[PDB]
Design a protein around this ligand. Structure first.
Ligand SMILES: Nc1ncnc2c1ncn2[C@@H]1O[C@H](COP(=O)(O)OP(=O)(O)OP(O)(O)=S)[C@@H](O)[C@H]1O
Ligand SMILES: Nc1ncnc2c1ncn2[C@@H]1O[C@H](COP(=O)(O)OP(=O)(O)OP(O)(O)=S)[C@@H](O)[C@H]1O
Ligand SMILES: Nc1ncnc2c1ncn2[C@@H]1O[C@H](COP(=O)(O)OP(=O)(O)OP(O)(O)=S)[C@@H](O)[C@H]1O
Ligand SMILES: Nc1ncnc2c1ncn2[C@@H]1O[C@H](COP(=O)(O)OP(=O)(O)OP(O)(O)=S)[C@@H](O)[C@H]1O
Ligand SMILES: Nc1ncnc2c1ncn2[C@@H]1O[C@H](COP(=O)(O)OP(=O)(O)OP(O)(O)=S)[C@@H](O)[C@H]1O
Ligand SMILES: [Mg+2]
Ligand SMILES: [Mg+2]
Ligand SMILES: [Mg+2]
Ligand SMILES: [Mg+2]
Ligand SMILES: [Mg+2]
Ligand SMILES: [Zn+2]
Ligand SMILES: [Zn+2]
Lengths: 460, 550, 550, 196
């Protein structure tokens, strides 16, 4: 039957991004030997993957689409349908199953036709998302209220959508709207989760709101003890950037969130799921470092290969079911040479992440404008989820007052109340995200929101 | 797809070796432990291409209870730099883990060429990876390394040295007996007709490998389908089963398949092969028959009298005489008598393999004959070695060139204890240097005269053993009239007379006579012509009187 | 741009092979499943460059219902290191996914040269990637690998071994019949005039590939436009349609295009081609005509009498005689009789291809003749092989050199069962070694004498079959006066006499005579000169009396 | 610095060929469309060095209304690995964009020697890049590839085979008639005396 890339379906953004070359058109350059409708070696339009263009624009890696249009010819294109080669290959560092050479499975049998290859941890030449647009500082300033009251760290989940980021060519931006937090037992240097219980529920809110789990955020905010918000400069050049337990644990969640792709052999490639670490700069102000594991770093967690050390910069190679061949990493020495060092038993963790930029809009107009809810799983600071706030939050005993539901924490609490049905809550999350007046007037005339009135006109 | 002992056939002696070399240390390592010797971990297979060398690996490997690991030559060379050498290290650790282990490496020369004759250091690393990891093994590992190639000379010889690869195992071209068995292997899956005589096929196939025979079986199957193509419409999505049941391959399909291009074999190498001609098929010259019965049959049958008498024999026999005197068949019939192996080497076969420079093979001629002892090495057309420089007159260069200087080393590099024998034959013996005629090298010199009329009678009896001759044929009256005519001339007359018979046979077919008349003969007898001048014979008879003056 | 069976033409026998090899296992894999043989997955195409080898791929591929993949030679070699070998792995996984699959690889030698003759290990990896991935396939995959080249010898032979590529399919140069069809393919899209006789063109085109013919069609189209350039102004942005309707290519445009810079095709190789001369076109010598009817026509027509008589024939025929006796045409007319294929090889063709060292092609001469059995191999100008070392006198080097030593191997490397025949011809037969004249190699020796006056009559009848001769011409009175004159001399007289006629014809055109007068003749008859000394003949007649003394 | 037909002189027969080969399919592709033949996209120039081979390129190219792209031989070979083959792909996409297009490549042998007689695989890639991209073209593109050299024998002959380069055009040494014209080209800018 068909290919996966003949049955999988891209995102609408991936539908938007395919119809563009992303080519950067030069005008008549230096060594033009032509009239103005001629060309020379120096007035061609440019590439999205052009390294001199990425160097002058200080752009670290090309986008995954700029990677896509680099590695593939234009003719090899899925609108052919049947005759299409997916240029992307999701890594398969597990074990060649169903081996066609007479020997048993991987277990009990091995030959050359079933073994995977030894890993060359180069830097990944591309990344998925380039910019991390936090849609409001009030998204953050709400979120960092737990740390200012306690001082211990905080984990969250990035919600939102992926849009075009036009500053870099073919840039995808992680527009961030919302954060939900599962039950968890919080400590200082590490965090261990409790299992998340309403897994279909909060995901249904994003399905209502038109959001999804677009990534993960957590914090590394250790106040440096001078009372301003300065940190111990701990995530920088000399120390490290990513804790290696954070790398594996995010790659656990990143394996839980791949992205379907019409350009890859499984019909899926990479991951929409991204990673952010809130920290502090050298200047003593609350900064953010955004990353994502490489497609090897996902696979070596999927194929159970690497392991953290006591040194956060060193990553251990696991000793011996499975198959652990060489790992390398290409270097640049002090005269530019590329030396693949033996990564057994340990190696730098540099070759596993990609760097991302991060920021804000010029003026905050997110899909959420309201902030009225005490955050879940904080009964250790007395910040709980009770029904009694809705008399002041949605203002239902003050029955004239308009709709303050523009709050994802509260929208999940309304979804925790689970009163509005699947069409009326998608009429709520219609009005909770778009705020139409005649549709608020429709929702204030719907039965279930008037049921949500008349139930909460009789509470205390 | 999983190979037992029954799936391979014919090379029984070779499989007898490998079971001693591979099956024996694995199911009983205690034997080498009880006798206190080291098990050989250096099993090497080699031979012509397409000779079941990959097939005999699993034929042993699947017939153990041992672990098996497989290495392909180009599969490692397909890999990238460093990662390719990783897989070899990943290979042996698994084998030293699962200690009853078999490591077969197909096409070992692709990962191991000569380090002198190679360019990439990546090739030089993976050779150096292999040489290291072979020595890193242990006798307590009880792990056997198998390797196969079709070019045993292209390998770096450091592998073929001791401790790494010691067991040179050649897979020769099978006899018509063994290749009959190979046909039965492929055809027992096939659906045949009752006319199929594989024994008739196996007689008619002489220098084929099993790959040629498998292609031979696949070819006659297609012609059987070609006969059914009228009954088979290709626009149909499924043909009916009635033509499938009638799809039985005929004997004539193989008669078709014997004349097609499959039948181009791989015979252009230095081969060893048992002959087929015998003493009855060579008429006359019983004196030099007995001389070969003296000189070469007594050592191959009884070395016991030599050590009784303390004397090593003369290992060097030179045939000479006029041309066209059957000197080629003489060494074949004596190897067919005492069942010694036989290697036919002609003159330009040395030269044409030295325009491509195959001279280790010239050493390997002696080595394979040493491997196939008892064997006789036959050097046909020694004048051609002189004719490499034209002659002894020639282009002023005599018989001596790079060929002779190689052969004089290799002939002297033979142990006198070995029963490996060297037979030389020319028709221009004056035109050869006495350095090759030196005692120790080639000291027995055998003149091959023309037969008499009794010899010419015996030849015409022997040549016409398979021909439906007439009954009125007085071969003695032919032998009376044939006087100066060689044994080649007599066969040439029959080739004329059969052509004269076909000038009666298919002439009548277009106008069965399976008889060779006197009228067929007396035309050719009138058309008979001598090929050897008697003044040329007076040279050779003076050499037959005395060539020892040289 | 999408190719059916009708878009290719002429090479019907070759397409008959590939439909058995590619169309047959795909639309009916049950046939090989019912008969229980393995489908061949090793289809290899080869031939001269520009011979529709890429064209015949899609001609098969688009005429299946099977998923047809594709891989260009230089496209993989254009790619970077490692990534190029990735695409091959990406190729076969898609084909083993879509199991009715066709993998055609154009220009296979660019990704697969000889591993001995190459420099980059990246080339050696992608060969090793290919050798690996060919063997990784399955019979249950039902996936056919096609490959084409123009240099079948430059390939690593490990591909051409068994299991990887077994089906050597040559695409030969088409006959004038088949290339007529090729012209009709290109011109049926073209707009022609009614004068166009492609059959006249196809007769006049002899060694062209279809690329030469397509360029031939494209050339005469341009000259047709060149005739219209007076009516076409290039500063105009669009020419009118009236000159487009009158744009019809004339026959004379092809007459222009016949002598164009396109005629020079690729005929500088070892070619196989059916001849055109017949027995009527060679006057006299009916004795040796019948001798060829005996010696070479009886085996190619009736092998049944041989197995009746148990005798293999003599496969080696040597022509000899004085020079200029039509010995070149003799082998052509006999291959034209019994419809055997024909390979003309001259003397320096061996040498000039060995200054570039094409000696596998010398083996491939025998292999292609084995591929095109029944075939005769004709060795013109054997004195030139002696004249490679000057002669037998020469530069003191005789006939024997690297050429002879190669040929003696390849002549002896022929199966006697094969009807592939070797025909030798020289005019200096003393100056050739008897090692090539050895029985088994070349034992039939045929003297070609001068004709008599009746033979000289028959030649002048046969030579003037296409000439508008006068009616008063007494060829017998010419044959009376022509005594010592060869058959070459008689044609030389006519070349003089026609030149004497043109010294009357266009001489009159400058001041139609389509007749060759006695006045045209008696000038050339007075100007007639013998080319062969009789004392040279007395040599050859002594050889015709006896050369068997050698 | 911008070359017309008048700026070249003497080799009239050769320019008569190229106008049939380059000027003719571009300003009138309908002619090959009306007659139903394929336009030759394999124009190859060759001759002795320094014979106006670069000069006759722009002498045709500036006398079209077609787009022109220029490729120098050593300019691609000056570039680094991979990036050099990128520019060829950047070349033909612009020409297949601006479909009336002329691609002239000066000194074609520097990017295309014999693959048998070469050492670097980077040379072997850029040959293989060229052989690929010549065949990737279309007749509907209406794009003409010009190439010039002084060593027609040093080229890989796979280019000179059919479909890639068919039009071998030699530029011979001019006669004293034609070289008289060439002198008049250079001296009409010069300031001479009347004795000349
Ligand atoms: N003695 C034999 N008996 C039965 N089948 C044989 C024999 N020799 C060859 N074959 C067949 O020929 C096929 C060719 O594969 P192999 O001969 O094993 O290749 P090889 O002999 O190892 O030489 P290579 O593969 O070119 S290195 C085998 O798979 C068998 O089907
Ligand atoms: N004594 C013999 N008995 C039987 N056949 C013979 C005898 N002598 C010659 N012949 C025949 O002679 C023919 C040629 O034999 P050859 O071995 O070629 O002669 P030769 O002595 O080897 O010299 P050359 O150089 O090989 S021709 C064959 O058909 C033989 O059957
Ligand atoms: N026999 C033929 N019939 C019809 N067209 C032909 C024939 N031979 C060549 N051509 C034409 O010439 C073109 C040359 O392409 P191919 O011959 O297929 O290339 P090739 O045969 O692989 O030789 P190469 O590419 O130089 S190795 C074909 O595409 C046809 O247009
Ligand atoms: N008996 C003949 N019948 C017909 N044409 C002949 C005859 N003798 C010679 N010719 C012609 O003269 C030429 C001789 O042909 P060739 O065989 O090439 O000459 P040759 O006898 O082989 O000797 P050389 O050394 O090659 S010229 C050809 O053009 C023949 O057509
Ligand atoms: N026939 C000519 N008419 C006019 N100017 C000419 C002629 N031949 C050469 N020239 C001049 O000399 C220059 C030669 O430069 P090029 O054409 O680049 O050399 P080439 O002919 O391309 O051969 P190269 O560059 O050595 S491979 C031209 O650019 C003109 O300036
Ligand atoms: Mg093998
Ligand atoms: Mg003999
Ligand atoms: Mg081709
Ligand atoms: Mg001749
Ligand atoms: Mg130039
Ligand atoms: Zn420019
Ligand atoms: Zn495996």
């Amino acid at each position: 039957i068909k290919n996966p890339w003949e049955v999988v379906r891209q995102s609408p953004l991936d539908d938007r991004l395919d119809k563009l070359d992303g080519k950067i058109p030069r005008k008549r350059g230096a060594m033009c030997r032509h009239g103005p409708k001629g060309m020379c070696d120096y007035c061609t339009p440019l590439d999205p993957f052009n390294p001199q263009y990425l160097e002058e624009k200080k752009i670290k890696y090309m986008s995954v689409h700029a990677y896509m249009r680099k590695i593939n010819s234009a003719t090899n294109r899925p609108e052919l349908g049947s005759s299409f080669i997916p240029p992307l290959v999701e890594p398969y560092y597990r074990v060649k199953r169903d081996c066609p050479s007479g020997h048993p499975q991987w277990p009990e049998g091995i030959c050359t036709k079933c073994q995977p290859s030894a890993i060359t941890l180069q830097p990944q030449p591309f990344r998925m998302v380039d910019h991390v647009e936090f849609a409001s500082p009030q998204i953050i300033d709400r979120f960092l209220d737990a740390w200012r009251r306690t001082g211990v760290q905080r984990l969250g989940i990035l919600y939102g959508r992926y849009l075009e980021y036009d500053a870099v060519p073919l840039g995808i931006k992680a527009v961030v709207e919302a954060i939900y937090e599962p039950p968890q037992v919080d400590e200082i240097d590490g965090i261990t989760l409790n299992p998340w219980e309403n897994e279909q529920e909060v995901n249904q809110v994003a399905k209502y709101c038109g959001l999804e789990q677009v990534g993960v955020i957590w914090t590394d905010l250790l106040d440096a003890g001078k009372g301003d918000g300065s940190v111990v400069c701990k995530r920088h050049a000399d120390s490290y950037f990513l804790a290696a337990q954070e790398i594996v644990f995010a790659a656990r969640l990143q394996a839980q969130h791949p992205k379907p792709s019409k350009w890859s052999d499984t019909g899926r490639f990479g991951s929409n799921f991204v990673t952010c670490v809130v920290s502090g700069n050298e200047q003593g102000e609350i900064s953010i470092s955004a990353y994502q594991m490489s497609n090897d770093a996902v696979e070596m967690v999927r194929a159970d290969i690497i392991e953290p050390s006591a040194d956060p910069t060193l990553m251990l190679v696991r000793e011996e079911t499975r198959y652990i061949p060489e790992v390398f990493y290409r270097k640049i020495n002090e005269y530019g040479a590329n030396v693949l060092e033996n990564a057994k038993p340990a190696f730098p963790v540099e070759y596993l992440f990609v760097t991302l930029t991060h920021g804000f809009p010029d003026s905050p107009s997110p899909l959420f404008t309201d902030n009225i809810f005490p955050i879940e799983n904080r009964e250790y600071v007395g910040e709980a989820q009770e029904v009694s706030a809705v008399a002041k939050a949605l203002k239902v005993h003050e029955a004239d007052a308009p709709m303050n539901v523009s709050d994802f924490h509260l929208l999940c609490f309304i979804h925790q109340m689970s009163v509005l049905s699947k069409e009326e809550e998608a009429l709520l999350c219609r009005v909770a995200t778009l705020h139409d007046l005649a549709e608020s007037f429709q929702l204030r005339s719907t039965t279930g929101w008037q049921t949500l009135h008349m139930i909460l006109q009789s509470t205390g | 797809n999983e190979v037992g002992y029954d799936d391979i056939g014919g090379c029984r002696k070779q499989l007898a070796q490998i079971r001693e070399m591979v099956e024996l240390p694995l199911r009983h390592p205690q034997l080498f432990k009880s006798i206190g010797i080291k098990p050989p971990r250096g099993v090497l297979l080699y031979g012509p291409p397409g000779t079941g060398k990959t097939l005999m690996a699993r034929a042993v490997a699947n017939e153990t209870g041992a672990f098996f690991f497989l290495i392909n030559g180009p599969e490692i060379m397909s890999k990238m730099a460093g990662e390719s050498e990783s897989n070899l290290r990943k290979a042996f650790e698994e084998a030293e883990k699962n200690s009853p282990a078999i490591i077969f490496i197909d096409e070992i020369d692709s990962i191991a060429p000569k380090r002198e004759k190679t360019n990439g250091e990546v090739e030089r690393r993976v050779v150096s990876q292999l040489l290291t990891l072979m020595d890193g093994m242990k006798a307590r590992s009880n792990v056997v390394v198998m390797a196969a190639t079709n070019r045993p000379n292209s390998i770096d010889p450091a592998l073929r040295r001791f401790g790494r690869f010691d067991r040179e195992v050649d897979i020769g071209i099978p006899d018509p007996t063994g290749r009959l068995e190979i046909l039965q292997i492929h055809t027992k899956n096939m659906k045949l007709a009752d006319d199929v005589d594989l024994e008739q096929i196996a007689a008619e196939t002489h220098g084929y490998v099993g790959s040629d025979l498998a292609a031979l079986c696949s070819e006659a199957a297609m012609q059987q389908i070609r006969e059914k193509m009228d009954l088979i419409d290709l626009d149909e999505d499924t043909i009916d089963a009635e033509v499938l049941d009638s799809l039985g391959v005929t004997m004539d399909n193989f008669r078709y398949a014997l004349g097609v291009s499959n039948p181009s074999a791989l015979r252009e190498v230095a081969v060893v092969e048992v002959p087929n001609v015998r003493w009855e098929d060579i008429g006359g010259l019983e004196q030099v028959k007995q001389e070969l019965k003296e000189q070469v049959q007594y050592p191959v049958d009884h070395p016991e009298k030599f050590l009784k008498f303390g004397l090593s024999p003369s290992r060097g026999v030179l045939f000479y005489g006029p041309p066209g005197t059957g000197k080629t068949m003489l060494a074949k019939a004596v190897a067919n008598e005492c069942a010694a192996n036989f290697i036919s080497v002609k003159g330009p076969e040395l030269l044409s393999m030295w325009f491509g420079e195959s001279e280790s093979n010239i050493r390997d001629i002696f080595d394979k004959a040493r491997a196939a002892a008892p064997c006789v090495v036959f050097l046909d057309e020694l004048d051609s070695i002189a004719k490499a420089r034209g002659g002894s007159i020639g282009d002023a260069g005599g018989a001596s060139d790079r060929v002779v200087n190689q052969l004089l080393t290799e002939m002297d590099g033979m142990t006198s204890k070995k029963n490996v024998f060297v037979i030389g034959a020319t028709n221009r013996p004056e035109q050869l240097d006495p350095a090759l005629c030196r005692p120790g090298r080639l000291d027995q010199l055998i003149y091959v005269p023309l037969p008499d009329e009794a010899g010419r009678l015996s030849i015409l009896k022997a040549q016409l053993r398979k021909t439906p001759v007439s009954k009125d044929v007085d071969l003695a009256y032919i032998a009376s009239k044939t006087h100066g005519f060689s044994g080649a001339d007599l066969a040439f007359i029959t080739q004329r007379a059969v052509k004269l018979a076909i000038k009666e046979s298919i002439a009548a077919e277009i106008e069965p006579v399976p008889e060779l008349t006197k009228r067929h003969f007396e035309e050719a007898m009138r058309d008979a012509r001598r090929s050897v001048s008697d003044v040329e014979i007076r040279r050779y008879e003076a050499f037959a009187q005395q060539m020892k003056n040289a």
